[model samples]
Target: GMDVFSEYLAGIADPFHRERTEEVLTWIKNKYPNLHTEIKWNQPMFTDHGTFIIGFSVSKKHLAVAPEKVTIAHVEDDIVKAGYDYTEQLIRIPWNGPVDYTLLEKMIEFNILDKADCSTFWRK
Candidate 1:
């Protein structure tokens, strides 16, 4: 599954961000082997069946976690508690800060179950 992201991950100039992004992606793959790993819209994303579950993107200063907006709103409290910045679209985990695997896990798990019945690639 990492094949889909090899070029994208390598394209990240910062070694720290590249390793961190790889770490999170590996974690998700290991944790949820059922999820399909692929690149969509120029980013690496995880999907269950045909539905989008989560995605990761790189920025100069942060690693962006993109889950659906509903899931983002659902976990706003935890996001704040984790000290990450976010909008309705994605959560920005600063490069200077540690990755909150717990929050990441929560969001991924949330989408997997919440969208278990979803038929489209994106939510309706």
Candidate 2:
């Protein structure tokens, strides 16, 4: 819910970006209510049982989705198939394009399951 990021979202000066970010965050929060939501270093992120699952930050041209390098390597093919760009660290989903929620869900689910026993915030 917005409660997790109201302050962060309020700081986004652009309405379009703010609304879009809110929509994405809201979707994830609703879909996985058990995931702990928080803003860390000014970025909104999700965690499951204290293990990092996913996070995203708004850029001028896109939302940068970070599921870590390992997850990116695993999903790079599907990322391209979904019409997004990526680096070794993040998926660049353009603000003007539609968000492939299915792809996002896959990435989140993968991280949650893969890191189920992780003892650290990030993959070790």
Candidate 3:
């Protein structure tokens, strides 16, 4: 039942990270049936027209929403509103902590639009 990404998610020792990571990935797939998946930089990532969109990863204490640094900046308010902290590259969604699915939805939708013309990659 576990594909590459699923296997990657399952390998995490933290149950909360493992479970919510699956939920987030599944939600993305559901939202974009045409989306693509691959392992890049040793992490499972999602793409659109060969450009990076978003990805999730397991950390020691939390799972993060790994969108581009610019994307994170654009949505930083949502992150704070959800009571999460973030760096340039990581939107820190904690394990068993509040999830800003709405923020995610908005971010993804924003990427789909902003990067629609960007058929090469989500980033340069």
Candidate 4:
């Protein structure tokens, strides 16, 4: 799965896409040392302390970061204007070119912190 995703990512002619992926992955691994990586639902998923937290996919036009639960919220207007969509819970970050790494990092951090406080059905 990683191979496939790597290939898909490699197909991206934009250096920004490739660089951003590396940046995001490295940031996640460093900031959340306990976070685990795996391929799920055909995309790269990141988990925290054994629980699923987020996943991301590389598309032709943009990169998508999917927080499994829709309860997470982000107030950045730019993200909203960029077609970044969310349900009652999950928030999606769309990256077409140079992304706001600071924004992405903050969002991921917020989601992880939020999930740590929320009680899941399995926990109850």
Give all TM-scores, in the order shown.
0.96, 0.96, 0.87, 0.62
How close to the true structure is residue 90 of candidate 1, measured as C-alpha lDDT?
Answer: 94
Better of 1 and 3 by lDDT: 1
Q: Please, what are the lDDT tens digits per residue for candidate 2 over residues 4-96? A: 799999999999999999999999999999999988898999988888899999889999999999999888889989888898889988989
Clashing pairs in 3: 51-121, 51-122
Top lDDT hit: 2
**Candidate 4 pairs with clashing backbones:** 69-90, 70-89, 70-90, 71-89
Write one digit per residue (lDDT tens) for candidate 3, span 1-124. 1275866876787776677778887777877777787777767778888888888777887777788888888888888888887888888777767677899888888887788878576576
lDDT of 1 by residue, 16-56 (tens): 88998998998898899889999988899999998999998
Q: What TM-score, to 2 decimals, does candidate 2 have?
A: 0.96
Report the Cα RMSD per candidate: 0.8, 0.9, 2.0, 4.4
Off by over 4 Å in 2: none
lDDT of 1 at 45: 93
Span of 10 residues, lowest total lDDT, candidate 3: 1-10
Error of 2 at 18 (Å): 0.7
Ranking by TM-score: 1, 2, 3, 4
2 or 4, which is superior by lDDT? 2
Task: Give lDDT tens digits, candidate 4, residues 1-124.
Answer: 2343465456668787787876777667667767776766666777666656767777656567665444334545645654566564444455644555666666667767867865562123
- lDDT of model number 4: 0.61
